[PDB]
Design an enzyme around this catalytic site. Structure first.
Site, PDB file in Angstrom:
ATOM      1  N   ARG C  48      -4.153 -11.451 -11.166  1.00  0.00           N
ATOM      2  CA  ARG C  48      -3.790 -10.726 -10.088  1.00  0.00           C
ATOM      3  C   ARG C  48      -4.140  -9.289 -10.190  1.00  0.00           C
ATOM      4  NH1 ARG C  48       0.925  -8.477 -10.070  1.00  0.00           N
ATOM      5  NH2 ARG C  48       2.289 -10.410 -11.036  1.00  0.00           N
ATOM      6  N   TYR C 100      -9.326  -3.674  17.153  1.00  0.00           N
ATOM      7  CA  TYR C 100      -9.269  -5.142  17.127  1.00  0.00           C
ATOM      8  C   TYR C 100      -7.797  -5.705  17.384  1.00  0.00           C
ATOM      9  CZ  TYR C 100      -9.169  -9.601  14.540  1.00  0.00           C
ATOM     10  OH  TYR C 100      -9.121 -10.882  14.103  1.00  0.00           O
ATOM     11  N   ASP C 172     -13.529   0.979  10.028  1.00  0.00           N
ATOM     12  CA  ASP C 172     -13.591  -0.380   9.856  1.00  0.00           C
ATOM     13  C   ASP C 172     -15.246  -0.593  10.283  1.00  0.00           C
ATOM     14  OD1 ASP C 172     -13.576  -3.336  10.409  1.00  0.00           O
ATOM     15  OD2 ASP C 172     -11.905  -3.199  11.153  1.00  0.00           O
ATOM     16  N   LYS C 197     -16.860 -12.063   7.982  1.00  0.00           N
ATOM     17  CA  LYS C 197     -17.772 -12.098   9.243  1.00  0.00           C
ATOM     18  C   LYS C 197     -19.110 -11.867   8.492  1.00  0.00           C
ATOM     19  CE  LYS C 197     -14.035 -12.004  11.425  1.00  0.00           C
ATOM     20  NZ  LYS C 197     -13.751 -10.832  12.220  1.00  0.00           N
TER      21      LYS C 197
END
Lengths: 376, 364, 364, 376
Positions: C48, C100, C172, C197
């Site tokens: 982690r 978004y 972004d 994406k």
């Protein structure tokens, strides 16, 4: 009737009819539930016989080579191994003298013990195949262009030679990929690939692919695959499908750099000669243009000696010294160091260097290799 | 020094010496950088010849079978075919008559075309093995217990015959696993497994594993595998290492359920016969106990007709109608169609599997 | 020194120094052996906090965005949420109004419950950004081009405002990728991506990536990620590294098709408007060309009504009706229902995508 | 109405209704095709919102904990992180003083900045929870037994305390697993796990799992998961399902060795004291037997000092010095070295050693640790 770049994305079956997932699910499974005994829910009962992730990559290679049946194997060697097991003891197969080294080893030291007799023929002359055909010859095995000297063989003629004498024609299309050369469209019975190279293209899958349009040859290949068990796993099947998606874009970036790199090698005084089917002075160069739409990214060129090749390798920065070819990263090798009469018949000399052009920037690859040659 | 359950966790090399990672890294890779031409940084040059994840699972099966070398193949059938390819045209192989159907297919339909003939023999009587030896016989291949009737063959005596007559002895140890039966310790040259079954254990890997202590045989298997490329991939290699870790616990739960399931079947009115090496009246039962420390989870029993068998499967709740065996989930099948019924005991609750099969038999 | 296509292949650490493997090993592992208490053999103690496969993809995104530190999250939404959590209760964030939809949801429905307020502003006119600054404003968050109308915001001028007013600037950069637009080179503090994406590129990974050059910000992101655990797994980390390798080739094929697709749409009788930063009459078109070396593959165009749009989708053959964008396959959607139509240009043949969309528009 | 060992194999949905595959397919996919706009083919549209491999492990944990809704997160910390985001600014949550160290850090240094006020309470006394309840307290967070000293808390009472005051009760069931302790059956609203530990159980997955039976609490957790995006990937979801299959067998082999190892530690003069809920002299030992069917494999025992613990670790052969717990391999740690007043309230002292019993042979584990203690 889609173009090649469209065929690589939508050719075959790489989606999930069940959930609509736009990529093939990875079926890490061994067996399948049957609602009624003997009644398979979707045609699946045991993953060695059939697995949905594997059937997806098998439908892709069949679509790319304009065939009807695809088969995925644990390695290109396993694909070739399954193809020759179509023959019986006392049967006879002809290959080109300059086949991939592992192919020579498999047929001479493994399959000769089973009664299969092998003949090697410089297939650059088509009629030389006919000299070695016997009443027991059943298979003609072509690897064009060859590894690593890229000797070109007339595919369309070798098919006619094979068709006339009742021979099973096989072409190893590893170097050209289905993007530039389609042996099945030229009369060949069986086309195979080492999918480890260009098709996967990311140096992370060892796999072999076979395709054919003949039904009964396919039912025999399925029988051998199910009975010798050299099947490709579901995870590797998926990574193959994923890598094939970008095959057209990767080949075209590779071909652009091959152009610029060849023009530099031929003009560098530290290079004795260059071997590639795109060169007009290359053997059977017009045969290649008649059967292929483009070029492989494997280039062979010879410096003076082996020690100069080792110094040249240490001078580069973007060429990775390793085995295999066709990956996104450019690879460099010395084929002589990575019998002598067979090695000479394969065109391998001392100082012979093999490069596999990656998808790095063209100017970066040319100037890196050129600067390295300046030190010799 | 190391007991069995401990050897499953720490046997072989299943950790990363580099980062100290406690599980084998998955090397989804094809080739490896060489510092100098021919200078392998860690002994790896090409994944078909050797892959570190595959070498991990290969070191596990050799450790679990007390062998020197291990080999991982893309299926159990591929492990068998690599072993059979040790021979040349004209050679003969002696096998138990009830050998696995896929082995029958691979030998009669494929390897006879290359001159390799097979002689089926009731190996439950070792005298029949000797009488079938020809001057061209080169290999003895046996399974014990076999499928689906679980016939037991004497491993030690089979090893003596192969030794005295110069045969390569092979034992398919799939049903028993290395946790209960170690043919190499009993004199056998080559032991092989369909890792698809118990070793993987979770119905999600198709794989074969081969182990031997003979250097010249391992060198030949290594050459055969590199030149026919029936290689197990890295991801499947990893899941194999992972599944083997619980092999001892799974087998022990399976064997506890087998005892209670056989006791129920032996007493049920709808059952006419039970086949398993744990029954004292089973042929060569004492032979099995002398060469094995436990039992397999495959059980065959007979009911009236195939109709009663089909109605048995639909009436159960925890038995999955499918091929294969040795998984965590219980599997059931009718071998003649894929009134003999074969079940594979999984790791479900013992009384659950006992009550569920009994209530289904009650409907017949 | 290293050009863009070369940096995609050799940027960051994506090889194994141990065995020389040419691809990043997949470390499906949770913990690591320590030689001494607190002595990390290679700097790893718990997956982690750090995983070698994740550290590989993290080093790639920082190299591709010319940053010092990279962070891989389990989704782009998780990358955004880790960045937003840099703030305390009462702080304010300035965003483009057409941000978004998932970012709108996460900020208004989740982070306002913790006192973090958001001020939506038409950032296409940088004056509106200044006028909305409060004494409690701490962060400027922008996308350019935005979804689905592809509105362009001046990155350089946004960086100056955040700097002059003491704001953490965030961009972004999903739609443009590091291959065409590098906000960190233009003064932005933190750049983030939905790697789901273009970076992944193959419709098979859900992931987020964050890069920054600020040590104190990276130390805070590292603490936030270790204490909220929105970690990208190793297998997804590997597929991310693998997909990024072809990012330059994919974008370039996408941009070649975008030119021809826009030319067809601009002339088709059934199309009333086209939205894309490559049109010279697009608002802030020259601003985009001054901060970007290329174009995104998302194109929005308008047809008569939603009925004509739905009939357009059924009439096509190579456009997949689904969410998401930036994949190798072409994607189409109607944003108001998931007559504006948004397409994601894939790497299919340019004339195939041109002819297929035109014949479908011909049916309207 | 199947027994626990049967529930681990057939509980929930881990098969493919489409092909009959007896294991969950791995959906390495991001989006899903829609036959009609807005019409989802099988309920899937985007993998962050829902993914079939993840829904399978989510249906498993829900079945194992007798809940109705499961949620899979990228880590146990991400699961706890999503649970506390059910609260608003100015809200109030009570935890046990001896929570897992990462939990303390997340609530004190991360979520206090968002207006959430935290109170720590030695929950070994039930009424001590009531001392710290305010009109803004909304959540009671219990971790029994605790890490690493295994303090036991009355689950059934804490549920009643939470139910009375309108509190959302949460139990961290990581150490007991659903095989031995089921907080949802005791009135608790939400149960969560670090699936990194016992559930996966093979030291190869970092994951968190949450389960509940309340509908509206589930719709709020789904909203937070979809909006903060700490989702577990499909590959890790699958390995979780695979590891859960053997949870019952692994816990029982662990419990057998815990018995034999404790009896050796309590009789070894080199050991000052042993901490485990199975000991009759242990705090709240009868509460554990009333709420749990078995025992965790974490054992704490203190040698004289830290230096003796380092020497003891170097003397073993089967205990792996690393972090985490609940794996097939036995792990050993020194919790003090892997603020001081909080560390003392967690029971962590110098010379305190934590072991996680694996599934190795019992006698091998006892004799290995005992021989190691003989050197002190």
């Amino acid at each position: 009737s889609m173009n090649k770049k469209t065929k690589l994305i939508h050719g075959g079956h790489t989606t999930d009819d069940y959930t609509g997932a736009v990529t093939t699910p990875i079926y890490q499974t061994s067996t399948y539930l049957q609602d009624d005994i003997g009644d398979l829910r979707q045609g699946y009962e045991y993953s060695r016989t059939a697995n949905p992730t594997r059937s997806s990559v098998e439908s892709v290679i069949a679509a790319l080579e304009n065939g009807k049946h695809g088969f995925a194997f644990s390695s290109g060697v396993a694909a070739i191994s399954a193809v020759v097991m179509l023959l019986d003891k006392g049967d006879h197969i002809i290959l080109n003298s300059d086949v991939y080294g592992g192919t020579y080893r498999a047929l001479t030291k493994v399959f000769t013990r089973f009664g299969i007799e092998v003949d090697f023929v410089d297939t650059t002359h088509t009629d030389s195949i006919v000299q070695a055909i016997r009443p027991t010859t059943k298979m003609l095995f072509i690897e064009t262009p060859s590894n690593p000297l890229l000797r070109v063989t007339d595919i369309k003629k070798s098919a006619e030679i094979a068709k006339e004498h009742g021979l099973i024609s096989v072409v190893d299309n590893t170097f050209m990929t289905p993007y530039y050369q389609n042996p099945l469209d030229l009369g060949i019975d069986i086309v195979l690939h080492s999918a480890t190279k260009y098709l996967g293209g990311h140096s992370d899958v060892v796999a072999g692919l076979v395709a054919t349009s003949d039904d009964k040859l396919a039912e025999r290949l399925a029988f051998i695959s199910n009975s010798t068990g050299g099947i490709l796993g579901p995870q590797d099947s998926y990574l193959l499908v994923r890598g094939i998606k970008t095959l057209g874009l990767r080949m075209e970036q590779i071909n652009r750099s091959v152009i610029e790199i060849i023009k530099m090698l031929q003009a560098h005084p530290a290079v004795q000669q260059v071997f590639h089917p795109s060169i007009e002075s290359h053997l059977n160069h017009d045969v290649h243009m008649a059967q292929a739409d483009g070029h492989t990214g494997v280039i062979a060129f010879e410096v003076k000696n082996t020690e100069s090749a080792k110094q040249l390798i240490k001078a580069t920065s973007y060429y990775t010294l390793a085995e295999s070819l066709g990956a996104v990263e450019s690879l460099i090798s010395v084929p002589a160091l990575m019998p002598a009469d067979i090695r000479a018949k394969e065109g391998i000399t001392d100082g012979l260097v093999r490069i596999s052009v990656g998808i790095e920037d063209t100017e970066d690859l040319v100037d890196d290799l050129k600067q390295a040659l300046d030190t010799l």
